[PDB]
Every structure is written in structure tokens, then in C-alpha cells.
Design a protein around this ligand. Structure first.
Ligand SMILES: NCc1ccc(C(F)(F)F)cc1
Length: 330
């Protein structure tokens, strides 16, 4: 079997993408953030603290004939940006774009951090990293992708994120009309539980390609591109008036500047990120300083190929016994 669902940016800057997901019987439709950097499916629910909910759609397990409490199980998760959430665990039926999994662990949030509460467009997260990162205790739970794997035509899913436009998440098949040229596959290390891979180098604008190995993760749940300080300094040095700001927390640039493109390597192939993709707009309403989409990973400890990079490509997450990542121009 297969599934296909449209994913839509939550705002005019593509800060995140939400995808409708059906949970329970009868279906309760929630808009979830598909996150290849984590492995928990957690949702706002009727069990979330009332003061911590501001306009989100909530999952109500008491109205689902298929919901079962996973007795004794708890979850607690903290994201790299400081966000966090925790609660208990139900099992229920979950469908994405026609693809249905029964007995999927649905982690009901009793407490959520402030950054989730103030984001009324995101009802929860659907983790698509490897199940070794799932935070359910004492019995670790499988992701939606892992549970669906056996019934999928092919053990793959693809991310086709749009620039200021809707895109597509496909499960179980590769849409050969969605990309141009060939798909370049590259090896994945699962050692840390991420879709971790090694980029073969980079170029800034029309400059020479610098062959160097950049280890990083493919993370649909991260907005920006986080790369080593040397790479990020070489990019912003080409933008008149750009500078790293301690008060803002990253590189900013005059909104009147035009940004060069950024090229990253996948084996022998090249993926070009247009300069417009790196513009994240004024740091405050009416400001003439704009925030950059390429930032240093030095504070984080891991390089992150977030939405800025992934939306420039058609990306195949191949969950075969030897996992691989495929990149194609589109
Ligand atoms: N989008 C999920 C996510 C968030 C943060 C990290 C970090 F910071 F640990 F790299 C990995 C994955």
C-alpha cells in the first residue's frame, strides 16, 4: 500500500510545515509537523493543561472507539531549541493520506512548553527518525514509518517541500514526475538515530566548489540550515553589510541586499539553494535588518540540513535494511 498527503507552510516565511493526520475512530483530524529529526508522535489532547492550549485542535481519546491506554507508559522529550513536552501514551489507529496503521503509539501531551502553546497552527509532531530515539518508557515505541514499513510497497518516504507553497509527503513509492534528472543516493549512519549523512562540499554563489566532508542530519523539523562556522563565515562574507549579531542570535544582513545562492554536494551531484530561500525577513516589524537562513552549528554540536536546504530538492528517505538518502533537483 501507499499514502500521499499535502504539506503546507504555517506562515509566509516557511517556518514549519503542517500535514493533516487522521487519528482515532471516528477520525479526528490534526495538523502535525512531520519531523525527521525526532521519533515521537505526540499531540495536544484533552489531557493537556488547559492554560497551555491556545487554539490547537486536540485529540480526545475518550471519543475514539479504537483508543487504548498504554498502561504505565510515559514519555518526556526535549528538542534542540529548548522546547519540551510530556504525558502518557495511548494506542490508536492513525492514517496519513490513505495509509493506515493500527495500534500506533499516540503520545498524549499533558504538559507542553511555551513555544508550542503560542503556535496555534501545529497540533503536534510526527517523528520520522529511527525508533531508537523514541522516548516512551519503559517500553520503547515504533514510529509511524516503522509500523507502516511491512505493508508499504517500498520501505521509503519522500519529502517534497515547497518554497512559499504547499508540498507533498509520499509513503511507499517514488513519484518520478516530481523531480528532474537522476536521484543521487548517499549512505546513512543510524548510529545516533538520525538520518545522518555526509555532504561532499559546498559553493557560494558562482564561486568554486570546495570539496570538504560535512557530516549532518536531514531534518524536516528544523527551519534553517546549520553548518560549521568556517562555511557560514565564507557565505556571509559575500553579502555587503552582513554581520553576526549577539543580540539577535545569528547572522543578519541589510534587507536591501541580494543574497547569493548556496550549493551543497551529494556525492558527485550538486543541489543549488536559491538566494531567495535564505532570506527570512526583518528581525522585527519595520526593521531594515533581515535574518539569514544559513547559521552556524557551533552552538549545537551537529550540522543540520533543515527546511532551507531540503525544500530545494526532492528527498528520498530510503528505510531499507541498509538505509540511504536520495537527493534530486526539482
Ligand atoms: N527536529 C528535531 C531535532 C531537533 C534538534 C536536534 C538537535 F539539536 F539535537 F540536533 C535534532 C533533531
Amino acid at each position: 500500500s501507499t499514502g500521499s498527503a499535502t504539506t503546507t507552510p504555517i506562515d509566509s516565511l516557511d517556518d514549519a510545515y503542517i500535514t493533516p493526520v487522521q487519528i482515532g475512530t471516528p477520525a479526528q483530524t490534526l495538523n502535525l509537523d512531520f519531523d525527521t529529526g525526532s521519533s515521537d508522535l505526540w499531540v495536544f489532547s484533552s489531557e493537556t493543561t488547559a492554560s497551555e492550549v491556545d487554539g490547537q485542535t486536540i485529540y480526545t481519546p475518550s471519543k475514539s472507539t479504537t483508543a487504548k491506554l498504554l498502561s504505565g507508559a510515559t514519555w518526556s522529550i526535549s528538542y534542540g531549541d529548548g522546547s519540551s513536552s510530556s504525558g502518557d501514551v495511548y494506542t490508536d489507529t492513525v492514517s496519513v493520506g490513505g495509509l493506515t496503521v493500527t495500534g500506533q503509539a499516540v503520545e498524549s501531551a499533558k504538559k507542553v512548553s511555551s513555544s508550542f502553546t503560542e503556535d496555534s497552527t501545529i497540533d503536534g509532531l510526527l517523528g520520522l527518525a529511527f525508533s531508537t530515539l523514541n522516548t516512551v518508557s519503559p517500553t520503547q515505541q515504533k514510529t509511524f514509518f516503522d509500523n507502516a514499513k511491512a505493508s508499504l510497497d517500498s520501505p521509503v518516504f519522500t519529502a517534497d517541500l515547497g518554497y512559499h507553497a504547499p508540498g507533498t509527503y509520499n509513503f511507499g513509492f517514488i513519484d518520478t514526475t516530481a523531480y528532474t534528472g537522476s536521484i543521487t543516493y548517499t549512505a546513512v549512519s543510524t548510529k545516533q538515530g538520525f538520518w545522518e549523512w555526509t555532504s561532499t562540499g559546498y559553493a557560494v554563489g558562482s564561486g568554486t566548489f570546495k570539496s570538504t566532508s560535512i557530516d549532518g542530519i536531514a531534518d524536516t523539523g528544523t527551519t534553517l540550515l546549520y553548518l560549521p562556522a568556517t562555511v557560514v563565515s565564507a557565505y556571509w562574507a559575500q553579502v555587503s553589510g552582513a554581520k553576526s549579531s549577539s543580540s539577535v542570535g545569528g547572522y543578519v544582513f541589510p534587507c536591501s541586499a541580494t543574497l547569493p545562492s548556496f550549493t551543497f554536494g551529494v556525492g558527485s551531484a550538486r543541489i543549488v539553494i536559491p538566494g531567495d530561500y535564505i532570506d527570512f525577513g526583518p528581525i522585527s516589524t519595520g526593521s531594515s535588518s533581515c535574518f539569514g537562513g544559513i547559521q552556524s552549528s557551533a552552538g549545537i554540536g551537529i550540522n543540520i540540513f533543515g527546511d532551507v536546504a531540503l525544500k530545494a530538492a526532492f528527498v528520498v528517505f530510503n528505510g531499507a535494511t541498509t538505509p540511504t538518502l536520495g537527493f534530486a533537483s526539482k
